């Protein structure tokens, strides 16, 4: 549908630090710290960055948290940039949170940032100096990775896409990267010509039609991959978000043994296994994903010889961010008589005058709020602010295009120009993909630690 | 649906100049020409623009000029860009023509290109040589327009946007521009505390959700605007890009007459009047509009005391670029039973064997070809080049997304790594709203010139 409304729907529609503390205390699980720098240079680094982009340290639910800092921004930002124009609230402390609940659930698994989910540099900088590895897309983000030293050596990337482009394979061979990701002989013909230091890792489907080689194709690949002299020691496998049943996890792993198995019928030894993304960044949760992962970790590949790794995206910066919006346009519409007897039985908006409230806020379907379609997103919209009664409201965006219609039709506050409108967990996915039309853009940022480490 | 292969459906798939010259002819109709420049003089720039962007004259239907130029520019690129990297072709001539072509159509209409439709400095820097107005909804294109000097005057600027936010009206009264569109009375309140010295333009419902005043509700607007000490002098009005027939333009222009004849009533005398865009820019062709449109505007605005103008958006950039994609990794897969037996009934395909073929090319959703969802568009596929057999394709996208998908299971000749994908009709709302989704993008352009103005 469109952008969740549900916190007003009925008449009367009012009303870890020490996780933290633990995981920078290591230097608990008999698996070595994940990253290069030791137990005092880790946190040396994100004080550093801290400093760096000079976030401040705002300690506290998380509803009650972003609305307090919300109203807080807008004060200071009323007394370049214009006090009305949209701003995020980036908590880089939230990165390091889910970094601790990562070591603490998954403590065997080095995780690899994705970097595509936001490849703001901030949030590379807090990770890498937290000692995570990272998972570039493409040859752009492997130079952001590489041009901001995030990397001591690039052995730390994983070309992760499972289909590369000719020149992105050069940079990725001139730059020194290893790993990469395979789901067709055609790209280990490629990767073998363009690329021969490369350590390949094959993909294999999990229960989309996009990415993931057939487990009945996997023979295949592994005899390209023999005959192109490719050295296989990896298998990887995305399921995404969206899968509800627990079991998907468990029979990709299932999956992914059988596929060892049958890499080791060929003479290659493997010792890298990827268990991909789409963890929830959002409190099926994270914890019961992982207490059933590790069991089948344990006996599968508890061995030792092969290191389990992972690329988590939105699970790091989906709590991370909060977006504002400032209504700046008003218009009332009337109602067709059709449209009035459907809305008075279903809305609880007081129908005696068939009105429709119609506002304009500074960011639409074209910017951050592309989430709708391309992740196919409900965010939750909340109004920060007398009786406001739930008239039935438009909610556009900036752009003049008719589409940028973030909502339609369905009761909401009263709301007057000057309001502002609070999105949490906007994190993922959103100003990755933005694009910049009409001119409009979230430039504004503001940067909170939710945790202290300063 | 999706991308238009209709091209490719059955199973033997095998098989202006004279008007620009006269558009640079002043010094035939009584109207004075667009712009403060001279015949002698709008000459000089647009071969200065040409000059300044090594425009290079190509001269010859449009498949087979673009497959040409495809072709030329494909077998020049192995000969700061990578020989496998989209590219546009952008066709300057394409924009003078479209140019030519509405003087001829339109003499009493001076356009004002809606800079929405693509920001690009060539566009806009070769449009304003020509004389044309410049329709910026935002402050940022307000800029663009006035910082290249593209303008002598801001009077060649309106703020076309009916919602505008409030630095958005400071910016504008602070450049000098004068002309703004209002739909709502608390428009009227902003901008005359905002905008003094401001010439409130009413936008008029068409038979629409989002802009545009309803025709009981201009009379409250006349009303806010006189109370509010609002200069207004124009009436304006949007039909959008697609729509029934020119019926549509003959009720919104006799509407913007009522509503003349209502200001007039209003103690105000009006004297602009804006068409809006939504004209088809490829080839409901615009002749039959403007000859539709042409005898109204006689006979209603006439007089000669209202001057009138236009926002015309993907009509002057429409026909413009060519983007070129390369396909460069592919797979083939299997289908199921109750799947095959689709095919057969329908696809031309031999469906023997269950094979499903998936393409990747270097432009996706995520990026120029956004225009499916925001839009709305299906653009032609062409394949620039043994046999071919028909195949279920499956062409996706650069991006990791599983969504990115330009089309899904539709029949397609056979495709090879290396070959192109020729889109044309890519200039309108492509670039301008496409996204840096993992960093890619198409940042090599070429530049041709259909027309010979130097």
Chains 1, 2 share one sequence.
Not at 246 to 270: E, I, L, M, T, W
């Amino acid at each position: 549908a469109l952008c969740h409304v549900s916190r007003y729907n009925h008449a009367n529609y009012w009303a870890s630090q020490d996780l933290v503390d633990l995981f920078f205390l290591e230097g608990f699980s008999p698996y070595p710290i994940y990253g290069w720098r030791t137990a005092e240079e880790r946190r040396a680094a994100v004080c550093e960055v801290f400093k760096t982009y000079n976030v401040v340290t705002r300690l506290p639910t998380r509803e009650q948290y972003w609305r307090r800092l919300s109203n807080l921004y807008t004060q200071k930002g009323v007394k370049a940039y214009e006090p009305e124009d949209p701003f995020y609230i980036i908590d880089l402390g939230r990165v390091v949170e889910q970094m601790a609940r990562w070591r603490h659930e998954l403590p065997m698994v080095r995780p690899y940032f994705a970097v595509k989910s936001n490849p703001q540099p901030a949030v590379l900088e807090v990770l890498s100096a937290l000692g995570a590895g990272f998972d570039c897309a493409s040859k752009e983000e492997i130079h952001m990775v590489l041009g901001r030293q995030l990397v001591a050596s690039p052995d730390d990337i994983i070309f992760a896409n499972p289909c590369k482009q000719l020149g992105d394979l050069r940079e990725a061979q001139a730059c020194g990267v290893t790993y990469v990701t395979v789901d067709n002989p055609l790209e280990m013909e490629k990767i073998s010509r363009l690329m021969p230091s490369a350590h390949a890792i094959i993909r294999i489907k999990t229960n989309s039609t996009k990415f993931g080689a057939p487990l009945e194709d996997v023979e295949g690949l592994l005899e390209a991959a023999r005959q192109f002299n490719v050295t296989v020691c990896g298998v990887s496998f995305h399921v995404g978000s969206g899968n509800d049943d627990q079991s998907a996890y468990v029979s990709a792993v299932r999956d992914a043994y059988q596929v060892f198995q049958q890499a080791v019928q060929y003479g290659f030894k493997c010792t890298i296994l990827d268990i991909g993304g789409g963890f929830p960044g959002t409190e099926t949760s994270f914890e019961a994903i992982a207490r059933t992962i590790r069991p089948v970790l344990a006996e599968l590949f508890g061995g030792g010889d092969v290191t389990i790794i992972s690329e988590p995206g939105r699970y790091f910066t989906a709590a991370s961010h909060a977006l504002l919006m400032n209504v700046f346009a008003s218009r009332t519409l009337r109602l067709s008589d059709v449209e009035v007897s459907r809305q008075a039985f279903q809305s609880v908006v007081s129908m005696d005058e068939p009105e429709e409230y119609q506002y304009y806020v500074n960011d639409g379907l074209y910017h951050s709020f592309n989430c709708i379609l391309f992740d196919h997103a409900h965010p939750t919209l909340l109004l920060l602010n007398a009786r406001r009664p739930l008239r039935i409201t438009t909610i556009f965006g900036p752009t003049c295009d008719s589409m940028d219609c973030i909502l339609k039709k369905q009761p909401f506050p009263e709301m007057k120009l000057g309001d502002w409108l609070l999105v949490p967990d906007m994190g993922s996915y959103t100003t990755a993909a933005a694009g910049f039309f009409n001119g409009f853009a979230t430039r504004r940022l503001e940067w909170v630690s939710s945790v202290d480490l300063c």
